[PDB]
Amino acid sequence: TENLYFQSMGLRTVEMKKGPTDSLGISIAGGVGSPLGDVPIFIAMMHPTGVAAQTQKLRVGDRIVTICGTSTEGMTHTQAVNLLKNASGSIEMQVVAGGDVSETSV
Template sequence: GPADSLGVSIAGGVGSPLGDVPIFIAMMHPNGLAAQTQKLRVGDRIVSICGTSTEGMTHSQAVSLLKSASGTIELQVVAGGEVSVVTGQQQDPPVSSLSFAGLTSTSIFQDDLGPPQYKTITLDRGPDGLGFSIVGGYGSPHGDLPIYVKTVFAKGAAAEDGRLKRGDQIIAVNGQTLEGVTHEEAVAILKRTKGTVTLTVLS
């Protein structure tokens, strides 16, 4: 429909911050058309858009193609479970999950407020702890959701730092992705952290 939103964020493309990697789905909006098909997954590589191959395409070319397409949009994808985007040092053994360090992706949302802002926030866990609560997770009462910040407490590392906001999505903790983890797993990962904690968040 003309008012419907595709509801995906894509990353990659020739000259992207990750290098010349294929265009892939970096995030999906739970209510977008892409999620409703139940056939697309985060990490899937987009091979062609409406019959046009994405081979050699830049990030912005792919974005404008998706934004200008109207009516039926046909995407050809390769399931990306094996796509490993590792930035910086090659990790050993290779991880078959997405590492979002230094990633810029563009959302194809109707209410486009500019690309999502990935931030790296480093918190020093003090006597009052990290100082925030989380909501969401895989298998949560509301469905399979990302992990979001629910509340930033008045005391604690997050309040002192001032950058973490209610509604921010936590992508990774100390480089460990929270993609597909349950609420309990995310809590355990956060509780296990000591000293300085690095959060990758999407505001």
């Protein structure tokens, strides 16, 4: 009754437990200092078998706005990876539509 309001604005909030594989099954790109330059952090790819796909609220090309309650504003690529790698229990992510990458089924 609060996620629903933000989704209408539309920021999407997702809760994820990591697998028995200790993985979210997503690849993130961007961030300050990333191999792409200082660009926002987004989801580049999603593993077929993995946890994030089962959310069905996470999409390739979503920008990551917050991770485990922390804004990604000014966050480096390496910090975002460290945060998600070390996180455990329920992992909160909030995202918005980006077109940093758009994907098409074929």
